[PDB]
Amino acid sequence: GLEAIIRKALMGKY
Amino acid sequence: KSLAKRIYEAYLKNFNMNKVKARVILSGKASNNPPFVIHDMETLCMAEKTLVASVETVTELTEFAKAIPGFANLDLNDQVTLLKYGVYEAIFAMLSSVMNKDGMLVAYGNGFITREFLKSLRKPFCDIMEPKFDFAMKFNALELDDSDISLFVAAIICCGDRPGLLNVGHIEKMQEGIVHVLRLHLQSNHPDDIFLFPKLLQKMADLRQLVTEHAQLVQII
């Protein structure tokens, strides 16, 4: 379920 | 070449806590203000009260991953896949850096919860952290520094056998470069432990099993 957390952090610099 | 340096820089840059700073805090040396010791129910209640008045841990690994050369070039779904299955292994790997035989540092090093207090809780809470103390005690016996740990964590994340990967070809070639760099760095940084790389390979498998055992024990809540 943490796929949501890691996908947000992947799109952090933008 | 220049891969071990850039991976070590991304580690020092993206991780607030490393083994150097953790060992400094654990040493109780260059500071007359030691971390708050959580060793009973009262002190635990004191610590829990200030916390209400981990996403950061996973975000730190995500920024560190996309800073590994080649990881940002992968497909987005593969970057999500590599991180979704390898984050817990990397967390428990680096968790050894803040652990000793008697406890562990918490809250960016501001607290220290003792090992005996954790295993004194009732079932099944006393079984959550003790398996990690067991791994960390034997993992810290390898005496890895942050330069080793940075390459070790990079090999945990960049592996081409994760379920559901698409561009498995590039991930396996990327792991080949990380593993080849880890093997050469190990013998240059720890030459008198010539079987250290096979030992680390077994630890990566122990982490996979420790994470699997962690998910089972988590679901009984």
Numbering used by the authors:
A (entry chain E): 684 to 697
B (entry chain A): 204 to 256, 280 to 447
Task: Please quote the authors directly.
However, the structural information about the unliganded PPARα/δ/γ-LBDs–corepressor complexes is far from sufficient. After screening hundreds of cocrystallization buffer sets as we had done previously, the PPARα-LBD–NCoR2 cocrystal was finally obtained. The enhanced degree of structural flexibility of the amino-terminus of helix 3 and the carboxy-terminus of helix 11 to helix 12 of both unliganded PPARα/γ-LBDs was supported by two independent solution-phase amide hydrogen/deuterium exchange (HDX) analyses that revealed stabilization of the PPARγ-LBD AAs 279–287 (helix 3) and AAs 470–477 (helix 12) by rosiglitazone. However, our results suggest that any ligand can enter this large ligand-binding cavity through these flexible regions rather than the entrance identified in the agonist-bound PPARγ-LBD cocrystal structures.
Peroxisome proliferator-activated receptors (PPARs), composed of the α/δ/γ subtypes, are ligand-activated nuclear receptors/transcription factors that sense endogenous fatty acids or therapeutic drugs to regulate lipid/glucose metabolism and oxidative stress. PPAR forms a multiprotein complex with a retinoid X receptor and corepressor complex in an unliganded/inactive state, and ligand binding induces the replacement of the corepressor complex with the coactivator complex to initiate the transcription of various genes, including the metabolic and antioxidant ones. All four coactivator peptides contain the consensus LXXLL motifs that interact with the activation function-2 (AF-2) helix 12 upon ligand activation, whereas the two corepressor peptides contain the consensus LXXXIXXXL motifs; we investigated their positions in the cocrystals. The same applied to the interaction of PPARγ-LBD and the SRC1 coactivator or the NCoR2 corepressor. These structural findings support the idea that the agonist-induced formation of the AF-2 helix 12 induces the dissociation of the corepressors and the association of the coactivators.
